[PDB]
RNA sequence: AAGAGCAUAGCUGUUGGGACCCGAAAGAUGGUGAACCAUCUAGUAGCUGGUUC
RNA sequence: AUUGGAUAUGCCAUAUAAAGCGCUUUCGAAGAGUCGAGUUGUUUGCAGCUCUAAAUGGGUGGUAAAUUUCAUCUAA
RNA sequence: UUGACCUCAAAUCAGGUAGGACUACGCGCUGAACAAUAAGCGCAGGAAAAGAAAAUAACCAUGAUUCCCUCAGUAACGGUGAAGCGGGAAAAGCUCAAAUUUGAAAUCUGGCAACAUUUCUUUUGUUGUCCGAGUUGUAAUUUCAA
């Protein structure tokens, strides 16, 4: 295949070939609003592996933030907010200025029958996985909140327990 | 805030009525999965023997049944595990050999015998596993005689001086890389 | 009034076999049941036994 | 396991049975597909400034500086010097 | 140096929880109107008053 | 009145089939502005900021020694 | 002169979907004068969250998560305050990306005609056919336990 060279490729942030292409894609971006639909991901590589295929129900949106609470998180809600009919999946980073971040979201139709009818991605149609980065439950959220596996990472204190006999 | 316990007698009678109706859900076969016999720990629990999650998967190559096969017939793997005193080999081992002996197969399909499975149905039985397989504690041992070379063997000549030469031995093997 | 005043009591498990205990062999006193307020002034015997 | 409980060999005297390798550990294992690939990109992406900058430090024997420099551009020092001594392999085979 | 403690109940004292009851301005959060409102609050009380055969 | 799914039964099915396990004469791809480091805030965790990785590598610890072996796991 | 492909519009075009309320319990963000609290904002379910180790340990080793007892008012910090181990409740495992099938895109939505089925004339499909999606990758196989 030729995604062993995408993210190969994709980890060489400072080489020149990412370094231009990077700011011909920010310079466009500025100019579009500022989150716009995508047609097809800018690293088919990067969705891909996020859960992403190239059928029907799926769908990309680009979105850019103000740096200066994590922008990664920032730009899912923002977009949840606008795509409001559609459970958001995912999301990635592409670009970056002076003054902006850039992101790629990958949202999925819970209501288009191909989508249901595909078993790896029935799970989100069922009501619990709707608007999960409200409840910050995405790959970002989940990290943000500190949620793992690990010594590493309230109430079980503060209540009083009053046996039956004691 | 406060956690009171008056729902404790009601929370005992609902795990009982929980089993009850687990039991009869699935009446033919046994209520409890079985579990290895496994080791806690540490140097206060190590001598005891308790039950561990799952048979790794060199103890069900060794018994002859495939890790998909043991699922199936209730047996559960764990993966994590790795067992390395080839006697945690051996007790799980018949440990799951005489769950083997003692299991009977329904065959599938209209009662035709597949491979070994079983020939006989109406020996159905739920069977507590803790009976049929108890988890014993370490055999220890009663009335061992002599060792009077054990005698002259006065503790501290290991014990007082390994754990110095144990304490020592960095400082040691420096030394002897240091003068080479 | 609070809920989790104490409602329950624990006691020894020995203490209350020794009670159950001294209470089955105060029944068979019959000093002791008429004091409670049994009438057995006609009952055959007591402890009473009747067959299986 | 001298029977005992102290020592440079101590622990509950059996015989330990050798253990297969399991594929967790394999990671970090070289595939020639995966070492081609990693040749190719790196031949056509090229290099970010600051190795740039090193090698010629290298070329002109400026070594102690070039590794106290690449020790600040990525943190640690098996990483600065992980990153010499490939950088020179690519000086000589240059 | 030939172990005396463990458990339960009661009484009394003390420490902390609103903490014997009643009572100070105030402060915060969020609102309504052109100051007010509701919660936090049963606050700070080193005191005043009362405290039952 | 429906339904629980099992029991038996009847009819189609398609079944030129695929899968499990002896072996390998070997191959094994494994998630990047992410990990990480410094820095600022806040309750090690997270977050802004600049830099920015690697393949027996990386995370984590018992050891050592301040480095080392060893153990255990395979993140984004 | 025409046809492709791409980018963007427009439809009172066909089909769908989002808002709002409840919020005891869930998960977030924010946060006071106590408290990772009250208030504020966002978003769910019958449970939610967590979850099949980048986890423990230093043992004769343990083996997803959650909860209870214990550890323990201990370690640690400077009044705050855990966790490993042990016992018990419950147990259930897994799916992708990373390689090809190149002797066949084997995949999928929708329009139309039939065959059905229904908690149900209200539901849910199937077959055929057409069309589009899709080689910037839908299927099959594989997920490190391999």
């Known amino acids: 295949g030729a995604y062993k060279y995408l993210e190969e490729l994709a980890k060489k942030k400072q080489s020149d070939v990412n370094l231009f292409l990077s700011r011909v894609r920010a310079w466009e971006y500025r100019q579009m609003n500022?989150?716009?639909?995508?047609?097809?991901?800018?690293?088919?590589?990067?969705?891909?592996?996020?859960?992403?295929?190239?059928?029907?129900?799926?769908?990309?949106?680009?979105?850019?933030?103000?740096?200066?609470?994590?922008?990664?998180?920032?730009?899912?809600?923002?977009?949840?907010?606008?795509?409001?009919?559609?459970?958001?999946?995912?999301?990635?980073?592409?670009?970056?200025?002076?003054?902006?971040?850039?992101?790629?979201?990958?949202?999925?139709?819970?209501?288009?029958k191909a989508i249901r009818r595909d078993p790896r991605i029935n799970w989100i149609v069922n009501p619990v996985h709707k608007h999960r980065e409200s409840r910050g439950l995405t790959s970002i959220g989940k990290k943000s909140r500190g949620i793992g596996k690990g010594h590493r990472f309230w109430l079980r204190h503060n209540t009083l327990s009053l046996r039956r006999y004691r | 805030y406060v956690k009171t316990w008056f729902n404790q007698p009601g929370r005992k009678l609902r795990r009982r009525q929980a089993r009850q109706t687990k039991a009869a859900k699935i009446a033919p076969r046994p209520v409890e999965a079985?579990?290895?016999?496994?080791?806690?720990?540490?140097?206060?629990?190590?001598?005891?023997?308790?039950?561990?999650?799952?048979?790794?998967?060199?103890?069900?190559?060794?018994?002859?049944?495939?890790?998909?096969?043991?699922?199936?017939?209730?047996?559960?793997?764990?993966?994590?595990?790795?067992?390395?005193?080839?006697?945690?080999?051996?007790?799980?081992?018949?440990?799951?050999?005489?769950?083997?002996?003692?299991?009977?197969?329904?065959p599938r399909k209209a009662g035709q015998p597949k491979k070994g499975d079983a020939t006989d149905?109406?020996?159905?039985?739920?069977?507590?596993?803790?009976?049929?397989?108890?988890?014993?504690?370490?055999?220890?041992?009663?009335?061992?005689?002599?060792?009077?070379?054990?005698?002259?063997?006065?503790?501290?000549?290991?014990?007082?001086?390994?754990?110095?030469?144990?304490?020592?031995?960095?400082?040691?093997?420096?030394?002897?890389?240091?003068?080479? | 009034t609070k809920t989790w005043r104490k409602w329950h009591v624990k006691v020894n498990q020995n203490e209350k076999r020794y009670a159950i205990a001294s209470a089955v062999a105060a029944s068979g006193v019959p000093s002791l049941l008429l004091a409670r307020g049994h009438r057995i002034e006609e009952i055959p015997e007591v402890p009473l036994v009747v067959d299986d | 396991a001298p029977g005992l409980v102290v020592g440079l060999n101590k622990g509950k005297?059996?015989?330990?049975?050798?253990?297969?390798?399991?594929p967790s550990r394999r990671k970090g294992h070289l595939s020639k597909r995966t070492a081609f690939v990693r040749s190719i990109?790196?031949?056509?992406?090229?290099?970010?400034?600051?190795?740039?900058?090193?090698?010629?430090?290298?070329?002109?024997?400026?070594?102690?500086?070039?590794?106290?420099?690449?020790?600040?551009?990525?943190?640690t020092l098996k990483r600065a010097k992980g990153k010499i001594e490939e950088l020179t392999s690519v000086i000589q085979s240059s």
Not at chain 4, 13 to 22: A, N
Request: hydrophobic share 35%.
């Open chain 1, 34 to 112: 500022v989150i716009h639909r995508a047609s097809r991901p800018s690293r088919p590589d990067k969705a891909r592996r996020l859960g992403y295929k190239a059928k029907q129900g799926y769908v990309i949106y680009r979105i850019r933030v103000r740096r200066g609470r994590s922008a990664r998180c920032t730009a899912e809600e923002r977009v949840g907010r606008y795509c409001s009919n559609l459970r958001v999946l995912n999301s990635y980073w592409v670009n970056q200025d002076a003054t902006y971040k850039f992101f790629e979201v990958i949202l999925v139709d819970p209501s288009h």
């Open chain 2, 34 to 106: 079985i579990r290895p016999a496994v080791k806690p720990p540490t140097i206060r629990y190590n001598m005891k023997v308790r039950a561990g999650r799952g048979f790794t998967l060199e103890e069900l190559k060794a018994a002859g049944v495939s890790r998909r096969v043991a699922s199936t017939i209730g047996i559960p793997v764990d993966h994590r595990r790795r067992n390395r005193s080839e006697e945690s080999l051996q007790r799980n081992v018949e440990r799951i050999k005489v769950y083997l002996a003692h299991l009977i197969v329904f």
């Open chain 2, 121 to 180: 149905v109406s020996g159905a039985e739920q069977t507590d596993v803790a009976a049929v397989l108890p988890i014993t504690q370490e055999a220890v041992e009663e009335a061992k005689p002599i060792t009077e070379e054990a005698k002259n063997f006065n503790a501290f000549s290991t014990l007082s001086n390994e754990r110095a030469y144990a304490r020592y031995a960095g400082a040691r093997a420096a030394f002897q890389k240091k003068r080479a």
């Open chain 4, 13 to 22: 005297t059996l015989t330990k049975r050798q253990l297969p390798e399991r």
């Open chain 4, 41 to 75: 990109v790196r031949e056509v992406a090229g290099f970010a400034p600051y190795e740039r900058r090193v090698m010629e430090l290298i070329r002109n024997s400026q070594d102690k500086r070039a590794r106290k420099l690449a020790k600040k551009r990525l943190g």
